[model samples]
Structures are given as structure tokens and as C-alpha cells.
Target: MAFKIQLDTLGQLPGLLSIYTQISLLYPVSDSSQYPTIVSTFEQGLKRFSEAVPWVAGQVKAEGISEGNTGTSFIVPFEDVPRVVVKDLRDDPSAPTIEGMRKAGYPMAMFDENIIAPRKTLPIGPGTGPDDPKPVILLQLNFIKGGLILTVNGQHGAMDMVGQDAVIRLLSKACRNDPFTEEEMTAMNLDRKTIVPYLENYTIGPEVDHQIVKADVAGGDVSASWAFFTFSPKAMSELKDAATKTLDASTKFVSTDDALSAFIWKSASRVRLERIDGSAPTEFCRAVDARPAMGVSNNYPGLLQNMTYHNSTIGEIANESLGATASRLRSELDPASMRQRTRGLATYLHNNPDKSNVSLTADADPSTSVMLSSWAKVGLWDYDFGLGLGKPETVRRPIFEPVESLMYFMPKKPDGEFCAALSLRDEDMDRLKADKEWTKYAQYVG
Candidate 1:
């Protein structure tokens, strides 16, 4: 029972979002007995979801403007929102148990790349020019003996992590037959014009040191391993308090996120600094969501984020107090500055057509850059599919092999216990784990 699907005509994607490629999230589930119901529920739910988030079912098309090539737009027609790609792994003898998959050492190995769907590989629509973009959303499900994998893949130009999480929640709600109210449906808007007042004035200057070029030149090895690090609330509080005490009164109130980021930056910089040449600068990078600062309403989907950076010599991080490093990070994320940067970036993207496929942190060199992404605020833990099925065992970003120094901070809990996913070479992972500060603040969750 194989099938293909697409969705109805919606509208054009925003300029800021049209420049990036696609992204995907893999959700692992236990209990495969409800496979049929689960599949059916997702399919039905998608139809409802499509009605609300029509862009998922839509395809990107050239605006065909004779004046200037302003990029692409989304067109949702009365087509299938994209039928789910299903795989049955029950007969595979190598499939691990749910516990083995989630908590075993090197948890990322449990993810079978062979079973995952290929994202941004196919043409978005028929006769789309070679330069035109692809579809915005794709779903794939794999069923194993004791579990399942629900992958939500979408366009970077259209959906960020927050938007992706919202889509999954909607799918789960639809599975439970909890349809969106008219008000809720009205809230699902992806138009960028309403939020960005000056689209025509949006222009981006050439960024000479974007991360994509660095990542391209510093390709990673195939043997990269993913590891988990957990920071208890007490540990985080202590780290934050220590950092805060070191800062002056004006910037003393550093947050947990800032503290953790600074610590990781220092620890990782130290590890690489010893192994690599000291003359080259080490950089710390993170993407800051600009929706709030830019006055974008809640629930307005699309890419509304900007990358903030802090570059320091390895010696600087090694010698600086945690508070100083955190202050640098906090200052870089100032709402006023971020909003201005976002506007500047919009102009930059408009000016550079070649940068249309850019992604957050894509401008950094993995060998010299440590990119941190925090999902601490994203509600991934609430992804429930109903039909007596509960929440997912855990959620993780797909391991991007090219960016070996990537760090992801998971959702924070009331108890203060939080998790992080990291992928690095064996030597780097070992050095980072053994760092005295890292040891003091984090414990191996595996």
C-alpha cells in the first residue's frame, strides 16, 4: 500500500525563510502494536494539519518577477500534503530494544540512517527550475519490533525548531481527534511581510566569514560519535551563581543558559586549543530567535532567527572568568542588537543569491567553531500521538556528520536536570568530558 501526496495552494514563503534548505527531527517510540492505528491517525491528522499549516503541503515556485529575482514563494494546491513514508523493521535481528536504543552508550548509533527519509533530495514540484526550491514539509515513519521512529522533515526557510515542534503537536492533537478551533487555525500564519515592515529595503552585505565555507573545507570523519551530558539543577545553579558573582553589578544577573553556554565554550575551547594551533581564533556561535524582539506575533511560522557569535583566542577563554565569557554571550544576544542584525541579515540575503541555501551556524568551521543550539524552550516532551499511545521516549536532532563540534541543549526541567547532545571525534569527546569544569558541572547520562 504505497502512496504519494501533496497539498492545496497556500501562498509564497517569506524572503528570510526562502534562503535556507530543509531540516528534520527524529522521534523514537516504543510499543509497535498500535502501528496501524498510529499510521492511520497520522495520515488523518496530516489532512487537518494541512488545513491549518497549508505550506507543509505546498511547493516552492519561482516568483517569476521580471524586475528582480527576489527568491521563491510557497504554493499550496489541492494536492496530497505528502503521504507518509513507512518502513517495517520488525524482522531485523539487529534492532535494539527500546531501552538499549535510548539509554545505551552512544545512543545515536541506535538511529538507522538506512531507514530514515532523505530530505531535500527530490525536486519540490514538476518542471521546477534547477534553481527553484523544494517542498516545505515531509513526514516519514519507521516501525520496529518494539518501537517506531516518527521523523518530521521541513524547509528551513519555512519552519524553525519551534515551528517544527508546533507542527508535531498539531499532528498529535489531530491523532487524538482534537481539531484546532477557528481561532487556533487563524493563528497559524507563515507570512513574513506582516512581521517585517520593510521587505524591499531588506538587503544583506556579503559575509566573508560565514560558517558554510568553513564546514565545507573542514569535512568531518565518518567515525564521529554522539554523546549525552546531563547537568543537574543544583550543578547549574552553582555554575550560574559562581559566574554571576564574578560579574560587575550591571551584568551580574547572568542566566542559567548563559552560564552553561559560557562553560561549554570555555571547556571546548580549551580542549581544541591544546590540540590545534593557538594563533587561529576559536569562535562560539548560537542562533537567537528574533520573533519576540522583532515583534513577530506568537504562532507566526517561518524562519525568524539570527546567529550570534563570540570569537576569542583560546587563551582568552582559558584565562577569562566564566562571568566574563557569559557577559560576552549575553551582550551578543541583546534584543535590540539582535533585531537590528536580523534586519541587516534580511538585506544581506536579498543581496546575495548564492547564500539562499544557508542554515544557522553554516558559516562556521567545525574544526575551529563550536555551535550551540538550545531546545530548552521547545516543547518536544509533549509530542503525544494519542490512541492510548503516550509521549515519545526521547527526541533528538539528527546527527549532522559534517558539523562535528555541534552541541544541543535539550529542554530544561523543573528539577533543573537538563540534557545535551554532542557529536565529536573520539579524542575531542574524551578531552571535553575530562575537563575539570565539565566534570564539575555535567555527568554522563548514558
Candidate 2:
């Protein structure tokens, strides 16, 4: 290890210290014998990328892994080991091949678990902590007969989607033999603690009560299965146009995203209410990137975000105008409202000792509520690894099992369409597929 230095976890440690986000990309490989040199090139790129952002190379120090360390929480970078691993699955009969997957239209919901793992999320507890190697970032390149799936597993405690994107961008530039922009380095190295200085004010208001932050409560993810759907650009325009007409005279503002989410929220509610009791109020929570409203740069390399919670009854959702529902969801994300909730949650977490009490979403009843996250327009597929492939065929999350009441809007497709990967109870997923109205705008891809 190169003079180990322990860095503070700051505000991110509380909720996500134990969580790691693993995303994989599948690229068609014409030849497998020429891969050794490419692996070395990627390793070199990781070195350069880590030199720019040192924390990513560090091993997480918390809970079980903190046994021998002086500080209870910190990351020690510079572990003396090769961070990249290459696995050849050419002989593995079950692994999907490029020719076969292309012929089958790329159903990413492959039968294999983790799909292609070894980079897994383990239970964080007394004896079981991070993996034995525990490098903050692990690159696993799985070479199948005619395809290569490259997965980057990053410590979620150190970064979120936005920050993770920055890391990947730097890595891609390095892989392409390009230099990082001076501005990029400056933003990447900005002190994490100072990014949200007001969090230290230790003061909060009732606005905190109005916001619902979610956490991984045990048993929340029950017998869930993945369901995929797509909405094209044309679909979005029509949805927005129709939603625009349902607005009240007093409310006039809405965006394309709002209309799209409204369509999903209402469609899902309509399906779910039919099978279960629909009397109680229902809520829809969408994760929001609070960086812009908080007056912080989008490039800020840290986990800075919140969720917008909109309340309505299932009856209303099933019967309401799409535009009206879209408008209600939009109100929660009003620039001023976003800022207050961001500050409120930040101050609340800082003031309160147990971070577990504060999560990304709370009080969202699974039967009646919906939680949606969008990975669209983040350019997830734009990272060029210099493999001669313009972009990965598709970008996806590595889910061992799906969580209930949650869904992800995947990155945009080449045809300007967007895909939604939702995890519903097995039976509900069946219901969602057969619901004729939901199918009007979205196509069932799985």
C-alpha cells in the first residue's frame, strides 16, 4: 500500500456505507484472442483514473472491516493488488453469445444469476462486511463466445450515479489515451465535506417532515420479478400533450418527464388497485438530483440527492387526468421546494445520530405507493471504452433480486426511446402486462 491515508466518509456514510452499485455493459467482441492487451490498457486507465480521484481506489472501512483500523469510518486507498480480473466464459455452455442474443433481440433478463457476477453485494453485518479483497472499484471482464460484458462495481457510499458517471468518464478518456480536462480535475477534487456546508448548520425545519426518504428495510423486497417496458420519443410527446390538457386553470407548468412519470404512476396504480384494497391514500416517490437546486455543480463528485413524494388516492389515480397527475408530481419538484427538502433532510441527518433512521424513502406503503428512478439522459451508454464499439448494446443494473414498489428508467436507446425496468410482485407483473391501457403507450419488452 502506498502510504495509506484514511479519508472521511462525510455525510454519505450513514445510509449508503454498506451499499455498492454494480452496472454492466455488454459489447460484441469479434475476437477473444486479442483481449490480453485490451485488459492491460484498461488496468492502466484505472490507475490514471484513480490518481485523479484517490478515494475510488480505497477499501471501505466501516462495521466489520473497521476491526483493526484506528478510525471507525474511512477509506484506505492504494491496496497493493491488480484491480482488474478477466474471466473467459467461452466454454460455459449457458453464457449468452452475441450471435444468439442479437438473433433473440437482447433480452437482458438472462437466466444466470447476477447475470455475470463475482462482483456481488454481500450482507453487511457483524462477521460479514465488504468482500475480502474489498477494493472500492472492481472491474470484471467476462468474455463469452462472441461477446464481452464489462461491469464496474463501485462503492455506493463514496458516490452516486452522477459522481459515478464522472468516474467512468475519466476512466474512458484515459482508456482512449486522452488527457483529463483541467476543469474536470478541479471539479473531481473539490472537497466533499464543503460541497454542502449548510448541512453542518445542525438546524432543520418542518419541511423535513413533508419529505419522505427511503431506506432498505428488511423484508421490503418480496418475491419480485423484473419487467421491462419502453416509451419512444413520439410516445413522450403525445403523453405530454394529452397531460397538458388535464391541468387546472391555476396550474400551467409541466415537463416531458413529468408527463411520462404520470403515465407510469397512474397506469401502475390502476393495475395494483384492482387486485388489492384501493381505499387508502397512495403516494408516488421519484428520486431527484438535488445538485442543481442546491446551487451545486452537476459534476460534484459525491452522493447529493433526494426524493419527491406526491400523495393521491388510488381511486383518484385510476380516474384522474394524466396532466393533473403530472402537475401534482411536478409541484413537489418545484425548484424552491427541492432546495428546502434537500436542506431539511441534510440538517436532519446531521442533527440526528442514527443515520439509519433517515433514508431515501419512508412511509411509502408498498401496496399503494410507487417509487421510480430515472437513469435517462445521463449518457450512461456514451462511455467509449475504445473497444471499437460505439457504445454498449445496453446499460443495466446488476440485480440479484428486484425490490418491490421500485422501478428504474434505463438510459435512452439509440432510436430515442426509453426503457423502464420495474420489479413488481410476480403476480402484479403479470397484471401489469395484461392491462390493456398501460400497453397503449408502453411496449412490454420482456
RMSD of each: 5.7, 3.8
Error of 2 at 233 (Å): 2.7
- Estimate every model's Cα lDDT from 0 to 1: 0.62, 0.69
- Please give, for residues 363-429, the per-residue lDDT of candidate 2 as tens digits: 7777677888887757668876766756888776665556777787777776777778787887788
In model 1, state the lDDT of residue 285. Answer: 80
Q: Among these predicted structures, which one has the highest TM-score?
A: 2
Most lDDT-accurate candidate:
2
TM-score of 2: 0.88
1-446: candidate 1 lDDT, tens digit per residue: 11122111111223234333222333445455678887888888887777656555765454444444534444444356655788776786786455566556325446544355545323333433545445666677777656766766665555666665666667777777786766556546534544544336543333223423343444211456777788888988898987998775557478889888888887877787768866667778886777787876455555566678877787788678989888888886678777666665555554453543444554556776778878777776666766455665666554434347777787665456677777777777888877886888878753
